[PDB]
């Protein structure tokens, strides 16, 4: 009798639920209605919203709630990636019910389902708006009335793949999804003290809930596998002297037996084509044609963005292969492996239903003494890999640093002048690099830093390049003339916002706006994703992403935003790291944080700030010097990627 136990549990609350016409959000909306709450459901398709509303209202009357027809409302055409539309959703909800007590940030899309090195930047941005920026947007508009009335709750529906406190969990090929789920948890952790005690804010993070989905995902896996084998062989041939752009006409002949027996093909490509013709299912054209159209366009994108070829070297496929490319048998073999992976994660060997998760969640929502937590209503999972955030302990080995002699360094930054200059001086004077290229945002910063190091600049050992925000272009320019990188160190162009996070009394003009939160995600998360996207394609690069310090004022709000940035970015660094471990060119990714775990640990004297800068140098070095590949150490290649090191 679960309905009987729900009765009156949330009597008189008004809940807004996004993505509320099916799945978990439909069940939470259903069970909140069955607990006496007025619910507004929001999704895109209006008829589904109508059918779910019908079903719920019927149950509400059977439960003997008064005037059941007026207890459920719908609001169609609500795409949570459309941040400006959420305002009309809220306006309508306050208009219909008078107030919002519960905000259930439930809607969540799957994202791009590509590796970091393949992800279109605007697909990344779209996932983050839908899964992450939507949640602050709704919270920020509702928080004033919620603070006023005081019985209020924000619930972000996150995931185990958004990690846990101080721990990131890599989700290969899903970095956008993982970053938005981590960011939902991070928002809960970072805001709870400012929104309390009137607003509780928590996340839930269910485990897995119950052509099919494993079929689409299996197909992507087979396509990715083929694309990686070709990219790898292309690099191994370019390694032996081949010019990649000149192999493209013959390669895009697409015939596997042609490529395998061409003397005009470098040996790597021939060994790959031989294996393919011998292993791939013969009932598919994949055994006779190298690539389909998707593989081809992505292969060219990896080569153009990695700087291996130019726009003029782009070729269409001579012959688009005939379906079926991958046979149904291959796709099923791989989908069963996907499914078994997921199922084997689970300690209980069974999955919850959407109703189960909803039920536990709706009970959880009745507890009034918990905030800033991540509740698992479904749970019990063993993960392939977890990465704890940590603190720098030790120094890099001399041998590894010597391997940096003569390399080219790319620095990306703007406002952290002292850090950038110290990095450059260290790389040139003590590491003996060939040269340091600095990519700034504004021209002025380029000129000032070129001045403070005018000596190295005259000698050609320091270069500056103002990007005016065009990160991809600067890396292409630098690669074109100033040398191909080893160490790449991305720092943020912009500082953290100096904004409040909660009201002083009933004044909210000073609290971080939705647009400002959007800018924060752009400049402290997407900025580094753009760097990692390009540099992950560069054979022989190392990537380090640096999260910003606080200002001298060092306000609690600023500290909260820094920890938000650190937690959210780590999901990217860990997923990029796990991807590197599996796919050539195995470019490592690691993260360095300039804000400490606890606020009392921040430097308070100039001597302590000197200790920090020294440590910062040592961590950037520890992650910049050549790291072990999977071939040298299977263990060390795993653990020396995906870290977040506080200094
Ligand atoms: N294995 C799991 O299912 C699992 C586990 C952990 C976490 N989660 C999280 O749980 C949440 C819901 O998962 P689910 O499996 O129930 O999702 P789902 O199957 O995609 O649920 C679909 C619901 O969301 C709506 N929706 C879809 N795209 C939308 C968009 N762009 N804007 C607004 N509404 C949209 C749909 O209506 P329309 O399509 O008509 O708009 C419908 O109401 C997500 O945040 C997800 O990350 C799920």
Author numbering: 573 to 782, 793 to 1229
Show sentences the authors wrote.
Malonyl-CoA reductase (MCR) is a NADPH-dependent bi-functional enzyme that performs alcohol dehydrogenase and aldehyde dehydrogenase (CoA-acylating) activities in the N- and C-terminal fragments, respectively. It catalyzes the two-step reduction of malonyl-CoA to 3-hydroxypropionate (3-HP), a key reaction in the autotrophic CO2 fixation cycles of Chloroflexaceae green non-sulfur bacteria and the archaea Crenarchaeota. In contrast, green non-sulfur bacteria, including members of the genera Chloroflexus and Roseiflexus, employ a single bi-functional MCR to catalyze both reduction reactions of malonyl-CoA. Full-length RfxMCR was a homodimer of two cross-interlocked subunits, each containing four tandemly arranged short-chain dehydrogenase/reductase (SDR) domains.
Similar to RfxMCR-N, a cofactor NADP+ and intermediate MSA were resolved at the interface between the SDR3 and ED domains. In the substrate-binding pocket, MSA was immobilized by hydrogen bonding interactions with Ser731 (3.0 Å) and Tyr749 (3.2 Å) from the SDR3 domain and Arg799 (3.5 Å) from the ED. When NADP+–MSA was bound, members of the SDR3 catalytic triad (Ser731–Lys753–Tyr749) were shifted toward the substrate-binding pocket to form hydrogen bonds with NADP+ and MSA.
